[model samples]
Target: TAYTPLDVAQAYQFPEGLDGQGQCIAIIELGGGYDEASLAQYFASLGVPAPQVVSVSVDGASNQPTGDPSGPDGHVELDIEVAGALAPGAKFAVYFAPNTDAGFLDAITTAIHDPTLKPSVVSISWGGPEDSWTSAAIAAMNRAFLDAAALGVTVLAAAGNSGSTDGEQDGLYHVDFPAASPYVLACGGTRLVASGGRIAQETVWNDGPDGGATGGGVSRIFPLPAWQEHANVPPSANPGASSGRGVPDLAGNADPATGYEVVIDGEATVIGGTSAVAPLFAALVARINQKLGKAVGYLNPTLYQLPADVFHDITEGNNDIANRAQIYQAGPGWDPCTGLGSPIGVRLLQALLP
Candidate 1:
């Protein structure tokens, strides 16, 4: 539970090189509640413009009294803070879907085709296990992603935090749904073990001994996309190589210990989790689009084509699952944990597009 608002802004390369003046980012939150007034004040205090925010209410879980496991408030705070920090001028639309299967898909579909509110990118920092989610529901959501991808709309989904454990019950590493969908850029988590000054000695985001580290593994349900072949990811990399499905096409700082900053009702807090990364990435995508005068639709393809120099590869550190006995390690050149790594600002902008 940490919110590194300043670090998040710096991580996304705000103002200096990328400006999201005209882009729009849609955020989907299934549980908890958000306080728009607080959000406005928070941004105003940061010297940024007040972002336009619209909300859709559905029957589901909202944030609890103190921000529990199903805390919707955490997601809301992170989404607003990170998105606004990067793309100060971009309008934000939040779809508060029910925690149920139908509600999730409905909100996503509605966000995708809403004519009056057609956002350039949608960020989802929530999801559940593939096994627990029906194939029909996952397919429906994936269809929405496909439609969005074709329309030059980008979607970012969070890779589950139960990475090294729970994702696979049978001694296999597996990935979760929505994140597993081919069209969505599955954002993974990394524990940035910052030692010296904030930025120095930064490493992958991990919550050792607590719940666990960042999630990455094979998928038991979905198959590997053809584009992944170029990376020459291990042949046993399919969703079902008797191993778990691989998740997280890219990653960012997610460890609460090295988390970003956010304010809820005037109380500052630090929050970490893959949940923090997706919206941040969405804001980045919006900024990129604003800079280029075009949207960076379906980032997985562009990211796959992006040259090696475009990002900050996270090759060190690992997430130790104290009980699972499995370790989630970061590898070079697109491992499941943090694919292509974090963005390198101007370098990424130059490398990703014309």
Candidate 2:
């Protein structure tokens, strides 16, 4: 057995007896599909029945799982396995869409508005930096997230893999989109170490490769939302403009060094990235919703209100690279990197549940 979902759930001490029974998670994917056999075997290995998995196509992207090891198909498998592993009893509605701006927006919109599915939470593991996208694209995507908020759907997106620059060629700090949007909970990444079946250490996921660090920073485009106007919220690089929204409202394990064991195309492997964090947190949200007996939609405001003790404050490391020459440090309350820090899961449950 690899670093299974049970390991993470136990490490965080997620409230027992809540199996995410009635919840439905909608995972938005830009490419790839999952193998049902792999999903079944993985779940069975964990001693749980596989969650109902449905593939919804948007913009001509169907559930086409190519068994190519080099393909993006692993993403689909990763998303389903991680989320399903944690919330075993919850259902999964995966929306596969072409890797385009419009396709991405359509997939999200369809998932949020799909009356039959009515997902309680949505997970997205694909996106680029805020500046890399066109204004219309960003606007449309943000609109989808805003719609999710109004519909009481908790949405989570990967902060990104490209460190503080967000894969930008230009030398400036950047944050990943959808995650940068105010309506979505931006999930960053951390290098986690557990000892004696408990979390012993955690730090910002920054291993100094091309796309290794946990993506975070002030958004250059979107202004600070009302919920982020607290005294604790960090300031922007551009002082003249309204302080931009701080990224990574939350974080989870994503370091490839301490990667998660996953089965893709019926082959077992270990993978890591902020992509993993998106579904990891989405499953956590599912647990929270199931325990609370309602959707805890758009958790940014509520997460901000909770005491620091509800989270394991990550006061170590910085999202910086020698090549990028830009840096964002982690601190007690909040910083650009690893915002509220990782979950003290049971305390988080108590805080979020009414």
Candidate 3:
């Protein structure tokens, strides 16, 4: 059975007695858009308090829903509903933009600079392999992330949905961009099954060769950060690589089989991908920020230093959908598939607090 947003949140053990009361979560949408009617119906169905959602048009993109659940609205709705349900008391700022590098950059920068929203965490559910991005675009967006950290704004990006190769035809490991940047929290994917109010089985999100899997492994464009120096991050699956940054610092339920159920363009359906995990973590951060009375910006450094029990180490499954010779696997510590594993939200919060 597919899980609802509240079900996944409960399984992850998101800290109780908080609902992101004083935080704003900024979600960047490159295409598709959410309408008020859908949002109202969704939260009511979940018994969640309606979130205060505001839309900002960047590069002339607006809340234009196309009534196609499989289209960009899929990403738009899944992100909003997931985050909204978990952080129902938080304010939401949805920045709509074109699917261009400039538009993407503008959307993020705009959200970061928006005085009204003052978003504590930004969620990005779209990205591709690092190679697909221009060097200049990468530099610009990476610079934006640096600014976000300085402003105490946390950033989360979907690693990708194409397994270890990142949908590249080169037959080698590839990590998604924005996620590869050291300043961003690279959210990965996992297949999660819950029973008795806790996860019964959870593994790296993989669905055979033809289907999707979590995008992870080493980065092609970024060097290893000082924070990840001892995470046992492996070198690139590419033959000639020495070392690089690991893509996802953590992972969550992104498998379509146990996906998040939400209202998309007036249609209730289940959808998954690494896309779902970004907002999942975003709302978690927002909720934590509420309890802390401050934002938990730049979380990766502290996350890498947490105790092993703070996250449920996913020791099963791999993102090697193609069965590459050098594909990464899940182990005790951080692996390319699910870095630091899926979080036990309360443990993560306690560590951050005390």
TM-score of 2: 0.95
Candidate 3 lDDT over 1-354, as tens digits, reads: 688888998999999999999899999999888767888999998888888888999998898888787788788888899999999889999999999989999999999998888899999988888988999999999999999999999999999998898898786678898899999999989989896559888888898667799988998788899999999998887889759999789999999988888888888788889998999989899889998888879988999988899999998878988875537788888999999899999988888885
RMSD of each: 3.4, 1.9, 1.2
1 against 3, candidate with superior TM-score? 3
Question: What do the candidate models score in CA lDDT, each in turn?
Answer: 0.71, 0.84, 0.89
Best by TM-score: 3
Mind sharing the TM-score for model 3? 0.97
1 or 2, greater by lDDT: 2
Note the residue pairs that clash in candidate 2.
none
In candidate 2 the C-alpha lDDT for residue 114 amounts to: 93
| Collision count of model 2 | 0
The better candidate by lDDT, 2 or 3, is 3
Deviation from native of the Cα of residue 279 in model 2, angstroms: 0.6
Order of all candidates by lDDT, from best down to worst?
3, 2, 1
lDDT of 1 by residue, 232-349 (tens): 4543333434533356788887887777777765567767788888887887788778888988788787778778877667887665454444355677777767767776566666
